[PDB]
Amino acid sequence: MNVPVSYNDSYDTRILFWAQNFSVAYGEHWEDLTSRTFGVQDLNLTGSFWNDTVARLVLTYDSLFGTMVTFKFILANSYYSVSARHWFTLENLEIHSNGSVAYFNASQVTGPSIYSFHCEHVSSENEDGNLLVPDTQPSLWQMTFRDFQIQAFNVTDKKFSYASDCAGFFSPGIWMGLLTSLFMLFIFTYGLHMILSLKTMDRFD
Template sequence: MVAHMWSGSVSLCFLLIYICSVYSTEFVPLFMWESSSESHPKEEIPALATITADEFKDIVMQKLQNKPVVVIFAEESLSVEDFSWKDEAGKGSFPNLESISSESDGLTYLPFVHAPLHAFRHHLPVQGREWYNLKLGPSSLSNDDIALNETLLYVNLDDAASDEDRPDLLKRHDAVISKVYRALAERHGDVLAVYTAHHSSWQTGEETPTRRIRHLLATDLEAGDEKAYGNNRTLLYAPTMILTIGQKSTTLENGIVGGDEDLIINFPDNITVVFSFENTKSPGYWSLQGVHVTVQNELYNFSDVKIGAPLEFSYHCSQEVVFNANDNKLNISNDFQIQPYIDGRRFGAAYDCVYFFTVPIWSGLFVCTVFTIIMIFGLGMIMDIKTMDRFDDPKGKTITINVAD
């Protein structure tokens, strides 16, 4: 009987733990904005509060008083970390949402909402209106006239590819959200847009930073990015290039890329910069042989270059890179990244110019070693101290004390 009660209690305990864990995983972030919010007053909502389904229903009911067009963009998974993520260039996954948030009224961001999609689909009265379900596909959603004429639009963003990184997926969805929302706002005027997910995509703190450090700018370079240069075999990312010839400095911008094995960039004012590479010195490695700059048909060679990495790896440097030749120099600002012998528009894993054991790290290790040696020596000296007992002489007669009953 006792064993049966004990097993029942254990089963109930595990059931409660399971229910609590499932319940906690259903808290997802929600981003909600409106094209017009003059019809109802704004309510202050604590930024870090957890919102239950009933509380969220009350919030949405206030926003539905004027029967706006409602569009829901539903990810399969989403987390607060997705909104705060940035690459080494400082760019997040939602540039279009940031632009929309600065233009729109009634902006609401709730980081922890319990089952918001369930509240929309099953608990909210829609006065006879039905949801129009639309799944993201290869065609542009903004061209779907039937969908744009609906007043309750549900866009399912479940189209992740197996070879697609999560930041790339979110950036692609961000572009779709912006396009659909602007088309609806232009056609209907009063639009309530919601961006949320079915489940949380929270990751442990050990996974996300590792990915950010390894890949750095390992994303497809955009064709219109003025900081990126690439031909069929070489990629270069240089935020700012400043060429100094004698006392004259020129900022190199708006370059046109050419060349095949070597990267040739033609800049205005008859300036050409050539990055030449080789992979014969060390097997399995590539190196930058030199940088050759031509200004008004006069050639300047920057051959004292120590840049290289294993094949299929890119070279990245978060510090300023300077190529010197006598009084002439070529400065490339922070976040310089380059890789030859590559197919496509994507950098490989980064081989950083800052080694793991930097000067501050070596200094810290040296100081810790010195203190450790001093500590060990001091403890040894303390343990070696022998105290004398004034009442006990090992060379004399043993003291005997008789105790009488």
């Protein structure tokens, strides 16, 4: 299987995307839209916009929960002053059912533009760490990525560049619990060091 790519009329490619599983859920039923995407090799992508600062991907499937339902990956590419770089960001996502719009937010899917984001689970159904949150919490549309890699605005040689993972040696919660524990371990080894030196007398009178 290969990626859905969007090549430009000018002699350079543009934004490309990959997953293993791609499942979208509506209400209770789970639909595996991964053979129609990567192995099918033909897709209806209406508007693959590019302006060198804002780009989109529309993926439409025509055979889903009832009707023709499209997914919209929305990326952006800004210049951040503090970091003096170009950082791409998956802005939100959109699913379009009967008229209605799903609006899944995806922060922590950001990257520094030259490289590519890559995550393991970009799933919905919030537990703690899921990158996709809806705008309304009792939402019906849910989606699941068992793999993930998107590059946008800086694609070269029709393939991905280095990865900017969601891997995270310390994500914030372990990095709060470590800063709490290793602070009060300085208190405990201080209280132990005073106790380890209260030595008794040698003789009595």
